[PDB]
Curated annotation (Swiss-Prot), chain A:
Disruption phenotype: Early postnatal lethality caused by abnormal cornification. Mice survive until weaning and probably die from malnutrition resulting from hyperkeratosis in the esophagus and forestomach that cause gastric obstruction. Defects are caused by constitutive activation Nfe2l2/Nrf2, leading to constitutive expression of phase 2 detoxifying enzymes. Mice lacking both Nfe2l2/Nrf2 and Keap1 reverse the hyperkeratosis phenotype and are healthy and viable in normal conditions. This is Kelch-like ECH-associated protein 1. GO terms for molecular function: disordered domain specific binding; identical protein binding; RNA polymerase II-specific DNA-binding transcription factor binding; transcription regulator inhibitor activity; ubiquitin-like ligase-substrate adaptor activity. The keyword Iron-sulfur does not apply. Substrate-specific adapter of a BCR (BTB-CUL3-RBX1) E3 ubiquitin ligase complex that regulates the response to oxidative stress by targeting NFE2L2/NRF2 for ubiquitination. KEAP1 acts as a key sensor of oxidative and electrophilic stress: in normal conditions, the BCR(KEAP1) complex mediates ubiquitination and degradation of NFE2L2/NRF2, a transcription factor regulating expression of many cytoprotective genes. Changing residue 91 to M: Impaired interaction with NFE2L2/NRF2. The modification S-cGMP-cysteine is found at residue 110. Kelch repeats lie at residues 3-48, 49-99, 100-146, 147-193, 195-240, 241-287. It comes from Mus musculus. The chain holds residues 325 to 613 of 624 of the full protein. The Kelch repeats mediate interaction with NFE2L2/NRF2, BPTF and PGAM5. The gene is Keap1. Belongs to the KEAP1 family.
Swiss-Prot record, chain B:
The chain holds residues 348 to 355 of 442 of the full protein. Changing residue 2 to A: Strongly decreased interaction with KEAP1. Homooligomer or heterooligomer; may form homotypic arrays. Dimerization interferes with ubiquitin binding. Component of a ternary complex with PAWR and PRKCZ. Forms a complex with JUB/Ajuba, PRKCZ and TRAF6. Identified in a complex with TRAF6 and CYLD. Identified in a heterotrimeric complex with ubiquitin and ZFAND5, where ZFAND5 and SQSTM1 both interact with the same ubiquitin molecule. This is Sequestosome-1. Changing residue 4 to A: Does not affect interaction with KEAP1. Decreased phosphorylation by ULK1. Residues 2-7 are annotated as: Interaction with KEAP1. Induction: By diethylmaleate, paraquat, menadione, sodium arsenite and cadmium chloride, arsenite and arsenate. By MG132, MG115, lactacystin and proteasome inhibitor I (PSI). By serum starvation, okadaic acid and glucose oxidase. Also up-regulated by RANK-L (at protein level). By etoposide and trichostatin. By the parkinsonian mimetic 6-hydroxydopamine (6-OHDA). By TGF-beta. The lineage of its organism: Eukaryota, Metazoa, Chordata, Craniata, Vertebrata. The gene is Sqstm1. Ubiquitination by UBE2D2 and UBE2D3 increases its ability to bind polyubiquitin chains by destabilizing the UBA dimer interface. Deubiquitination by USP15 releases target vesicles for fast transport into the cell periphery. Deacetylated by HDAC6. Disruption phenotype: Impaired induced osteoclastogenesis. It is found in: Cytoplasmic vesicle, Autophagosome; Preautophagosomal structure; Cytoplasm, Cytosol; Nucleus, PML body. It comes from Mus musculus. The modification Phosphoserine is found at residue 4.
Length: 289, 8
């Protein structure tokens, strides 16, 4: 039995909460807080360990974009610092391939990244790889068939609907079919043969629409929309289902957690986080202790 | 307020 981990986030100020949800009994667990508060970060799992990457600490004492990478061990319930990225990345995108972590775009100060970095766990090192064709922050990133996808985001001027794909063996980026909707800060994940883009901000209102890209047919298609509209949401897949946690709808920071079942193409409210928030890194791994 | 995230 695995769990859904939610790290950091934002509600009134960046939070350092590490909470976990168990789909089996619907309960939550609070774990060791993050050493430093952060939101706009990305989470991911490698070799059973949880990684909190980038983000920003939006506090009263001031904003501080982070280039930190920290590891959380369910076995000990403790956070250990790792090699830091060559640059701070707020509202970062993250994906994993062959046990390697890819940090995509994000922002630093008023600058929007197009750069990308790859982290080697065993050697504990980061190295820059080919930069995206576009500068993107608030970008959603997912990995399918060992290929990395960068969807939507913001290049400083316009919210994007475009997306591209990175092919490791060639260290090159290639644009792909753009989405039907301009999406910034959407939850992007992979389920079966599709890359999902849920919610986000199109420059006018937080979205509740969800579209998926078929790598084969190379086209996007709208599926059942989520109950709530939500941007800067946490997302992840668990036992053939999409889970979207929190986010901002333009009025309040949501605490609702919706679940998507492809079979019946329907969403359901499955639980609520201990409290509403946005920009939280999400990932799945073994339960603690 | 940031429309996309709701952050101040």
């Amino acid at each position: 039995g695995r769990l859904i981990y939610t790290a950091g986030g934002y509600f009134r100020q960046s939070l350092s909460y590490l909470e976990a949800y168990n789909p089996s009994n619907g309960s939550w667990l609070r774990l060791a807080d993050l050493q430093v508060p952060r939101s706009g970060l990305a989470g991911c799992v490698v070799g059973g360990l949880l990684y909190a990457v980038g983000g920003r600490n939006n506090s009263p004492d001031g904003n501080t974009d982070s280039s930190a990478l920290d590891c959380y061990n369910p076995m000990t319930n403790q956070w250990s610092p790792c090699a830091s990225m060559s640059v701070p990345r707020n509202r970062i995108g993250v994906g994993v391939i062959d046990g390697h972590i890819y940090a995509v775009g994000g922002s630093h100060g008023c600058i929007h990244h197009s750069s990308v970095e790859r982290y080697e766990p065993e050697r504990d090192e980061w190295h820059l790889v080919a930069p995206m064709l576009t500068r993107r922050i608030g970008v959603g990133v997912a990995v399918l068939n060992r290929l990395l996808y960068a969807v939507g985001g913001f290049d400083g001027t316009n919210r994007l609907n475009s997306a591209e794909c990175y092919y490791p063996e060639r260290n090159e980026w290639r644009m792909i079919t753009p989405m039907n909707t301009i999406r910034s800060g959407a939850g992007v994940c992979v389920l079966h043969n599709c890359i999902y883009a849920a919610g986000g901000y199109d420059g006018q209102d937080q979205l509740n629409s969800v579209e998926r890209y078929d790598v084969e047919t190379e086209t996007w298609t709208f599926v059942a929309p989520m109950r709530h509209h939500r941007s800067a949401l946490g997302i992840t897949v668990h036992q053939g289902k999409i889970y979207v946690l929190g986010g901002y709808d333009g009025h309040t920071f949501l605490d609702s957690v919706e679940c998507y079942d492809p079979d019946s193409d329907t969403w359901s409210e499955v639980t609520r986080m201990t409290s509403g928030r946005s920009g939280v890194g999400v990932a799945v791994t073994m339960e603690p202790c | 307020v940031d429309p996309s995230t709701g952050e101040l």
